[PDB]
Design a protein around this ligand. Structure first.
Ligand code: CLA
Ligand code: CLA
Ligand code: CLA
Ligand code: CLA
Ligand code: CLA
Ligand code: CLA
Ligand code: CLA
Ligand SMILES: CCCCCCCCCCCCCCCCCC(=O)OC[C@H](CO[C@@H]1O[C@H](CO)[C@H](O)[C@H](O)[C@H]1O)OC(=O)CCCCCCCCCCCCCCCCC
Ligand SMILES: CCCCCCCCCCCCCCCC(=O)OC[C@H](COP(=O)(O)OC[C@@H](O)CO)OC(=O)CCCCCCCCCCCCCCC
Ligand SMILES: CC1=C(/C=C/C(C)=C\C=C\C(C)=C\C=C\C=C(C)/C=C/C=C(C)/C=C/C2=C(C)CCCC2(C)C)C(C)(C)CCC1
Ligand SMILES: CC1=C(C/C=C(\C)CCC[C@H](C)CCC[C@H](C)CCCC(C)C)C(=O)c2ccccc2C1=O
Ligand code: SF4
Lengths: 87, 80, 160, 142, 742, 34, 160
């Protein structure tokens, strides 16, 4: 099955599950998402505030956590276990 | 990609070409043997590097010699 | 009689099985937000984000380490929103690596039949850019709405 | 030797479909088309895996690798008395004829081809790597 | 058309072909030139397809090899009955088996090994056997060692008959190819003549011999005063005093009053409370039923009498819209290829041996089988290893059928052609379910190890933590316990005690069986089992499917079966062969079967095997630690591999010290395997070149050139020592631990 | 311990953020076409 | 020598003789005195008592563990521990090495030299296995005559 007039159809370049419908939403739903997700578009810009915002948000709740929230900030609550040879 | 080199110890027994699975080797005329032919590797960019030619070479030591160098999509044997 | 080759071609690595080209399956897969080739890729990326955002609150509130406290709504939703923010950066660095700014689309233009269609804009440097922001806003809203419907309104379910 | 032109009108062998066929390397990098003339309707082993009914006339088979063309080609050169040729097809539309380059198979010698990659010395007269430090040349290519 | 085709004297019975070693192969008939000739001499010794291209002489070779195998098995059975007759305490064990251990091997007092002749009981010294022959002879009704000696010399007579038939069917009257291709007659005479009449004859033995002798053995009668087996046949009043249904004398059989045979043909179920083994009225009704059912099934196929089935007509009518021309040519596959039939027969025999292992710990068929824990562990472990080896060999000969007997012209658009046409889908979806099973079982084990290490026992997968109760197994076990009341009326009790019907059977103060619990630990280890079986299926099915060709190597069928590689090309084509997939599936069989027998040993040492004291209290060997420690790898290393190995390492200076020696030597053979597995041929070849130089210096060079072992041979030697060393390690640890605590 | 909260800060950054910085910047770098 | 008491006067070596018979005597308590397995343990005890009376009479050295230690330095008291059975060994091991070397010379000058190693010529083998008795006089005799070693010009040597 080789054609020499359509090179994509004879090699497997098929949109197997694609659709050519232009739109199925309405204008009210579409204008809401592009307004809110307009500052999240650029890859270089989005990678900057996700690293800087992600480093702050793990250091905040890592430090403001309580004893019941995380056991490493609870500390010891009993007498320490003495090892052998008096150590 | 891979560099296949033919040396002057070749007897023109043709079995390096017959063992080749990617059509690298061909028999060119020569004046250094009884068979009056030596192998050559023009399509050495198509060489996978399998060394089937070195397994089929009866000359001690080998006349066809494959050196595994830079590997591309020809010499990796991929279909994707 | 039931199994065909992929679009009549036996030498492409696939088959037209009932799990691939059913009347019901090929209707389904053609309406999923990833295979809309003419919709702008920020809008269909919000639906890919709302979905995955919602579903991920479930295994993080019912299985996580803080599942036996009263903070199980707050701990698991921020854990579900944390996987959104990581996968947004995984979506960010994929579009930086795969697609270059100013290139064409690495997409099959031809459909199942022989009709010529427009190129899919998602496999571009700017199409995956708006797709990444669609997953970030949709994912953070999909987590927050699943947190609202589970631990703010507290709707009755057998497991919550 | 004038290279043969790919007709792109000869049909395919009767094959039920395989999953070992053309992946996306066919779509963006290359794929290989092997064309051969048949005496009659036979059954051959597909190099992607499977069996197909080959036609009574000329046949066209699309393969992904150059090794699949020789594995098929040496199969229908020993089991069948069929001369074959294959090509290399690129996604831009260029068909590169590959084998046999002179029209006669590389096992047989032709006067037209020249010696390339042939060393006039042996392996034991190759130079040591210590006296070829920091050069583009290596112990075998000179 | 089915009739006897033989021909007379194909090859002359001569020793001139014994003197030439490599006579079967053309390459080995020239004599040796390197030391690899010796290894290809043994590698191609049994490979009859590589000798000749004629399937007739191949089939004659296989038939006489079957007779030689039958001679070897009859010599082995002769030895095990002679060891029961002369070197055992079978009469002493048969007097009272709850205190005397079964022993049938006496060693010679030569080098300090006479300590291995331990105090097994009954005034006897010897190696305590775990093969179960004593309980088998008790179930056969064997009372004296003269009967064991008679069975040994009868087996020697049959071994001479198999040797004579192997000589006869290769040198005097050997069958032709169409005699072996009469598969309908062979199935008719194997179903009816072999498995039907064999079950009927053993049913007759279990009516006349096993049943009254084993009934007298339940009454506490001494075996020296029990009447001999022919006295029940002769004096039928002696047979009628134990079963009154014998007083009618074969008239209810031909008048269809079979319910009047309800005295000795019962559907009881469960175990004998006297002995702990299944009832022989049930085992005699079982054999009579599978005989009146295998003899019915042996009248199915068409030989030459008109009635029957041509199985080509069965296959060629089985075709579907999802397949098209399926099942066609499979008769031509299975009558022209010995390897395809060998693949099917090996898969059924290995899976059947696994069925045997489960249907013997769970429904112990022999008296005092369950309470002798050494026999139960060794029989389950032995049959699991044999079954795993035979299913890996099934995939092996499947792959040999692909590389040497699969004709693509005769197989177009059938099932096999389409399975080859989508083998990427099969292997990829198998790969997905293997990775999914690997995470969702072993990563669950890693999660339990991590939260048990991090001091979070509530964050685990325990019976007290997040529960993963096997609700399907826990429902099928209740369905099999609450069966007799409604779905299987005519049963006195239930099929097995491990279902949940109570009946705490105490034989000799030791637990035969009880209800087996299934919890989170059993769920985790069964998902380990499903994962390991699936991965073994993945390597083995990948080797079967990619035996012909691949995306990597499209001419792999021309390279053969036992080829190492194509070379360092295409990135490296190491272990592309189907043989190498059998080689890796042998390791995955080690992993699968070893975790199966480890789960078995820990599960029944913790929840089944033990002792019963007064007032109905059951103390197990490792009390209740399977539900809490077998969910972590540290428990498996600690409460199984360390706590239960506290009898294989301090067995020195006792009768079980040979288990310590073979435990350590099995570690040696395993670490010796890692020399062959991790290394390669060229290093050893140049080291042998240095040794050959040292031999040339002192003029002790052999003319047979010393060579390193081949890459296929180096992998074969490595996997043989890996399986031998690891299996012998588990054998030594099992047979020291469960003998010591049993 | 002098400052107990720098365990709570640097172990999340060097354990989670810094591999997410390093592996994402390397994956951009190793897949640059240049 | 080396801080080791002799085994005839070692209290630990006599303790191991006492606790070995006592282990075997307790094994004898559960058998009849005229029974066949009791004769094996009675032969084991007499084998043990022969062993301990042989180790003390050879001047063996026993440590603090009560175990006989071998002095392999070449002591005039301790010749039978290493020096005497080592010279007995090397005579036997040189016998194996001389009749295997002389067999290869005898089959290298044959029509088919490789068929005489898989199929060992027993009349050729047994006529030189007797000749391996006097092998130090034949190995150093071949060493002095130059027939033991091969010159390096006739030896296959791998290249540099
Ligand atoms: C009713 C007749 C009958 C019965 C009983 C059997 C029984 C057997 N066949 Mg056979 N066979 C028969 C007819 C029969 N065959 C027919 C008609 C065909 C031709 C189409 C074949 C061709 C065939 C081949 C090619 C092979 C067998 C093999 C086997 C053996 C099975 C392997 C094994 O270990 O089993 C358990 C083994 C035993 C219980 C040993 C029993 C041996 C005694 C002496 C009986 C065998 C003699 C004879 C078949 C029946 C005589 C009955 C006698 C007791 C009165 C077994 C001996 C296999 C084998 O091992 O080859 C030797 C093999 O692959 N059969
Ligand atoms: C192949 C197996 C086999 C064989 C050789 C025997 C052999 C015998 N049976 Mg039978 N029998 C068998 C199966 C067998 N039976 C089974 C499975 C059952 C259950 C239906 C019995 C139950 C049975 C009864 C009830 C009696 C015999 C009897 C007989 C004897 C005379 C019949 C005869 O030889 O024909 C003979 C000793 C009679 C006899 O003499 O008893 C010893 C007798 O009364 N049989
Ligand atoms: C019904 C049983 C059965 C059948 C008929 C055969 C038949 C055959 N097998 Mg095998 N196979 C089976 C089951 C069986 N196998 C099982 C159990 C496995 C898994 C291990 C396989 C895996 C398989 C592969 C991997 C291949 C075959 C092949 C062979 C062929 C010839 C091998 C040969 O010459 O022997 C050679 C015999 C030996 C080298 C003896 C060594 C025995 C083992 C490996 C080591 C010793 C084990 C022993 C118990 C330990 C004692 C130690 C002690 C001495 C210190 C022949 C067709 C080969 C072939 O080319 O097929 C065409 C081959 O490549 N087999
Ligand atoms: C303990 C040793 C070990 C481990 C970890 C593996 C791991 C693997 N083997 Mg195996 N195998 C081993 C020894 C090992 N093998 C040896 C001895 C051999 C040589 C014979 C083989 C050869 C081999 C074959 C030939 C095959 C496997 C395959 C696989 C995979 C099984 C699927 C699975 O469990 O996915 C889950 C992965 C794991 C359980 C690994 C641990 C990962 C943890 C749980 C995740 C958490 C870590 C975290 C992300 C870190 C941050 C997996 C990647 C099969 C495969 O690739 O297809 C499925 C395959 O076909 N094995
Ligand atoms: C290579 C040297 C070395 C290593 C092995 C570590 C190891 C550790 N540090 Mg660190 N530390 C280092 C250098 C080192 N330190 C030095 C020189 C300083 C003095 C300024 C610090 C100050 C420091 C703080 C303040 C803290 C740790 C902590 C920790 C732990 C978590 C990792 C982390 O947050 O890093 C943090 C790392 C830094 C702030 C600076 C690291 C600079 C090093 C030299 C980089 C080396 C790169 C290496 C050569 C590449 C390979 C871990 C045990 C935490 C802890 O105690 O856990 C409970 C924490 O709170 N470190
Ligand atoms: C040093 C490395 C590092 C550190 C700091 C942690 C830290 C944590 N792990 Mg983790 N983990 C790591 C390595 C790391 N992991 C790796 C290598 C493995 C693989 C073997 C695991 C596997 C693992 C699993 C399977 C899970 C944990 C979970 C946890 C949490 C336990 C504390 C708790 O109860 O919070 C309870 C939970 C919360 C308080 C939710 C907080 C989620 C925040 C808000 C995410 C916010 C966005 C995020 C910061 C964006 C990152 C950007 C990027 C630059 C890093 C905690 C957040 C558990 C968890 O809950 O994950 C969240 C859990 O399910 N770990
Ligand atoms: C025919 C007798 C013969 C002779 C005289 C020797 C003598 C020699 N061999 Mg040996 N060798 C032989 C048989 C022989 N070998 C055989 C059969 C094998 C295969 C097992 C080897 C394998 C071999 C190795 C692996 C090594 C030697 C080396 C040596 C040297 C020192 C002895 C040694 O290492 O212990 C003997 C070593 C063995 C492994 C024992 C094999 C001896 C067998 C049992 C004798 C069989 C003879 C009988 C007629 C058959 C010496 C030059 C070493 C060397 O390179 O030289 C310094 C060395 O590395 N040999
Ligand atoms: C009963 C077991 C013995 C069966 C021997 C059968 C057989 O091979 O002998 C039958 C052999 C057949 O004779 C064969 O003849 C050949 C030439 O045609 C060669 O000479 C063989 O060496 C010779 O075995 O007859 C003999 O001459 C007997 C000697 C060999 C048997 C020795 C038994 C030890
Ligand atoms: C185990 C059952 C799995 C269901 C499978 C089953 O129901 O088979 C149904 C289907 C039967 O196909 P046909 O109707 O062609 O079958 C006629 C049969 O006689 C085969 O010749 O088998 C397949 O197509 C295999 C599909 C396996 C699909 C992947 C499953 C793994
Ligand atoms: C003799 C000799 C010697 C010695 C030797 C040694 C050194 C040893 C080694 C050894 C070791 C160090 C180890 C080993 C081990 C062993 C083993 C290990 C074996 C086994 C075998 C068998 C046969 C097996 C069996 C089995 C099976 C098969 C399965 C199951 C299990 C069982 C176990 C049962 C020397 C050289 C000096 C000198 C010469 C001679
Ligand atoms: C050790 C080793 C060898 C060398 C193995 C050899 C040479 C086998 C040795 C067999 C015996 C010991 C030699 C032959 C013995 C003769 C029968 C002579 C008898 C002498 C005594 C044994 C009595 C390989 O060839 C190899 C190949 C590929 C991967 C790994 C390895 C590998 O690990
Ligand atoms: S196989 Fe070797 S000797 Fe023969 S033609 Fe090729 S290079 Fe020359």
């Amino acid at each position: 099955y080789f054609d020499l007039g359509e090179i994509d159809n004879t090699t497997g370049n098929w949109d197997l599950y694609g659709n050519d419908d232009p739109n199925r939403y309405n204008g009210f739903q579409n204008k809401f998402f592009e307004t809110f997700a307009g500052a999240f578009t650029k890859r270089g810009l989005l990678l900057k505030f996700l690293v800087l915002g992600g480093a702050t948000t793990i250091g905040y709740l890592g430090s403001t956590s309580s004893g019941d929230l995380l056991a490493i900030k609870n500390g010891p609550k009993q007498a320490p276990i003495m090892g052998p040879r008096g150590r | 990609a891979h560099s296949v080199k033919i040396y002057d110890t070749c007897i023109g027994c043709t079995q390096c070409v017959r063992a080749c699975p990617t059509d690298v080797l061909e028999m060119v005329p020569w004046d250094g043997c009884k068979a009056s032919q030596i192998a050559s590797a023009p399509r050495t960019e198509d060489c996978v590097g399998c060394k089937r030619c070195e397994s089929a070479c009866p000359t001690d030591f080998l006349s066809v010699r494959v050196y595994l160098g830079a590997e591309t999509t020809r010499s990796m044997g991929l279909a994707y | 009689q039931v199994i065909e080759p992929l679009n009549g071609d036996p030498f492409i690595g696939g088959l037209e099985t009932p799990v691939t080209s059913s009347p019901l399956i090929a209707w389904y897969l053609s309406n999923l937000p990833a295979y809309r080739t003419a919709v702008a890729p920020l809008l269909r990326g919000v639906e890919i984000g709302l979905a995955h955002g919602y579903l991920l609150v479930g295994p993080f509130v019912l299985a996580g380490p803080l599942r036996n406290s009263a903070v199980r709504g707050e701990a698991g939703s921020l854990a579900a929103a944390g996987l959104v923010a990581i996968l947004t950066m995984c979506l960010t660095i994929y579009g930086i690596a795969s697609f270059k700014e100013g290139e064409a689309s690495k997409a099959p233009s031809l459909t199942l039949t022989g009709r010529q269609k427009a190129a899919d804009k998602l496999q571009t440097a700017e199409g995956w850019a708006g797709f990444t922001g669609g997953f970030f806003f949709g994912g953070l809203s999909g987590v927050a709405w699943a947190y609202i419907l589970l631990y703010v309104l507290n709707l009755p379910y057998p497991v919550k | 030797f004038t290279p043969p032109t790919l007709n792109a009108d000869t049909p395919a062998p009767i094959f039920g479909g395989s999953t070992g066929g053309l992946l996306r390397k066919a779509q963006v990098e290359e794929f290989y088309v092997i064309t051969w003339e048949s005496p009659k309707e036979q059954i051959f082993e597909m190099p992607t895996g499977g069996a197909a009914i080959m036609r009574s006339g000329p046949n066209l088979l699309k393969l992904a690798r150059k090794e699949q063309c020789l594995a098929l080609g040496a199969r229908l050169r020993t089991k069948f008395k069929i001369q074959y040729q294959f090509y290399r097809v690129f996604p831009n539309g260029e068909v590169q004829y590959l084998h046999p380059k002179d029209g006669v198979y590389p096992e047989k010698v032709n006067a037209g081809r020249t010696a390339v990659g042939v060393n006039n010395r042996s392996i034991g007269q190759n130079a040591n790597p210590a006296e070829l430090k920091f050069a583009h040349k290596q112990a075998y290519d000179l | 058309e089915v009739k006897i085709m033989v021909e007379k004297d194909p090859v002359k019975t001569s020793f001139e072909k014994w003197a030439k070693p490599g006579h079967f192969s053309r390459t080995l008939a020239k004599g040796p030139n390197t030391t690899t000739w010796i290894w290809n001499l043994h590698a191609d010794a049994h490979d009859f397809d590589s000798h000749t291209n004629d399937l007739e002489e191949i089939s004659r070779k296989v038939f006489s090899a079957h007779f030689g195998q039958l001679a070897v098995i009859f010599i082995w059975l002769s030895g095990m009955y002679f060891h029961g007759a002369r070197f055992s305490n079978y009469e002493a064990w048969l007097s009272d088996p709850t205190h005397i251990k079964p022993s049938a091997q006496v060693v010679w007092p030569i080098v300090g090994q006479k300590i291995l002749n331990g105090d097994v009981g009954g005034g006897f010294q010897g190696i305590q056997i775990t093969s179960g022959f004593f309980q088998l002879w008790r179930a056969s009704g064997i009372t004296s060692e003269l009967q064991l000696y008679t069975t040994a010399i009868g087996g020697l007579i049959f071994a001479a008959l198999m040797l004579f038939a192997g000589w006869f069917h290769y040198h005097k009257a050997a069958p032709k190819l169409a005699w072996f291709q009469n598969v309908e007659s062979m199935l008719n005479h194997h179903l009816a003549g072999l498995l039907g009449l064999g079950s009927l004859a053993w049913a007759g033995h279990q009516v006349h011999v096993s049943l009254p002798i084993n009934r007298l053995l339940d009454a506490g009668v001494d075996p020296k005063e029990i009447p001999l087996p022919h006295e029940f046949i002769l004096n039928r009043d002696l047979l009628a005093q134990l079963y009154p249904s014998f007083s009618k004398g074969l008239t209810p059989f031909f008048t269809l009053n079979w319910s009047e045979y309800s005295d000795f043909l019962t559907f009881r179920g469960g175990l004998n409370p006297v002995t702990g083994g299944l009832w022989l009225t049930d085992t005699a009704h079982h054999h009579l039923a599978i005989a009146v059912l295998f003899l019915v099934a042996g009248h199915m196929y068409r030989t030459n009498f008109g009635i029957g089935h041509s199985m080509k007509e069965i296959l060629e009518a089985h075709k579907g819209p999802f397949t098209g021309e399926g099942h066609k040519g499979l008769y031509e596959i299975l009558t022209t290829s010995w390897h395809a039939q060998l693949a099917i027969n090996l898969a059924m025999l290995g899976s059947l041996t696994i069925i045997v292992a489960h249907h013997m710990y769970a429904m112990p068929p022999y008296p005092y089988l369950a309470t002798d824990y050494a026999t139960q562990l060794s029989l389950f472990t032995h049959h699991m290893w044999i079954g795993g080896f035979l299913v890996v060999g099934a995939a092996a000969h499947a792959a040999i059928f692909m590389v040497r007997d699969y004709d693509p012209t005769t197989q177009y658009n059938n099932l096999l052609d389409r399975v080859l046409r989508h083998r990427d889908a099969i292997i990829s979806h198998l790969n997905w379910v293997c990775i999914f099973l690997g995470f969702h079982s072993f990563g669950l084990y890693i999660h339990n190890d991590t939260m048990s290490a991090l001091g979070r026992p509530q964050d685990m997968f325990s019976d007290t933590a997040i529960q993963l109760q096997p609700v399907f197994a826990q429902w099928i076990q209740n369905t099999h316990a609450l069966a007799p009341s409604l779905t299987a009326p005519n049963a006195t009790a239930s099929t097995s005690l491990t279902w949940g019907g109570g009946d705490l059977v105490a034989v000799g103060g030791k637990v035969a069986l009880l209800p087996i619990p299934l919890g989170t630990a059993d769920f985790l280890v069964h998902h380990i089992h499903a994962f390991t079986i699936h991965v073994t299926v993945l390597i083995l099915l990948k080797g079967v499917l990619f035996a012909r060709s691949s995306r990597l190597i499209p001419d792999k069928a021309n390279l053969g079966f036992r080829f190492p590689c194509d070379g360092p090309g295409r990135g490296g084509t190491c272990q592309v062969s189907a043989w190498d997939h059998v080689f890796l599936g042998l390791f995955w069989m080690y992993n699968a079967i070893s975790v199966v027998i480890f789960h078995f040993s820990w599960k029944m040492q913790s929840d089944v095997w033990g002792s019963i004291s007064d007032q109905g209290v059951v103390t197990h060997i490792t009390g209740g630690n399977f539900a809490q420690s077998s969910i972590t790898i540290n428990g498996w290393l600690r409460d199984f591999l360390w706590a239960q190995a506290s009898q294989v390492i301090q067995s020195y200076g006792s009768s079980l010290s040979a288990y310590g020696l073979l435990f350590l030597g099995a570690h040696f053979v395993w670490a010796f395997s890692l020399m062959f597995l991790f290394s390669g041929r060229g290093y050893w070849q140049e080291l042998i070149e240095s040794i050959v130089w040292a031999h040339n210096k002192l003029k002790v060079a052999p003319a047979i050139q010393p060579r390193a072992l081949s890459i296929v041979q180096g992998r074969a030697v490595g996997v043989a020592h890996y399986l031998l060393g690891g299996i012998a390690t588990t054998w030594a640890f099992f047979l020291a631990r469960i003998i010591s605590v049993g | 311990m002098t400052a107990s909260y720098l365990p709570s800060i640097f172990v999340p950054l060097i354990g989670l953020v810094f591999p997410a910085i390093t592996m994402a910047s390397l994956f951009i770098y190793i897949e640059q076409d240049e | 020598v080396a801080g080791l008491t002799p085994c005839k006067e070692s209290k630990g070596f006599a303790k191991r003789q006492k606790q070995e018979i006592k282990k075997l005597e307790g094994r004898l308590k559960l058998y009849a005195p005229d029974s066949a397995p009791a004769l094996a343990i009675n032969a084991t005890i007499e084998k043990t008592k022969r062993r301990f009376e042989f180790y003390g009479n050879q001047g063996l050295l026993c440590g603090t563990d009560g175990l006989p230690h071998l002095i392999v330095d070449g002591d005039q008291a301790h010749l039978g521990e290493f020096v005497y059975p080592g010279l007995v060994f090397l005579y036997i091991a040189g016998w194996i090495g001389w009749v295997g070397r002389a067999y290869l010379i005898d089959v290298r000058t044959s029509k088919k030299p490789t068929e005489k190693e898989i199929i060992i010529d027993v009349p050729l083998a047994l006529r030189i296995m007797s000749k391996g008795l006097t092998w130090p006089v034949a190995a150093i005799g071949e060493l002095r005559s130059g027939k033991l070693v091969e010159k390096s010009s006739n030896i296959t040597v791998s290249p540099r």
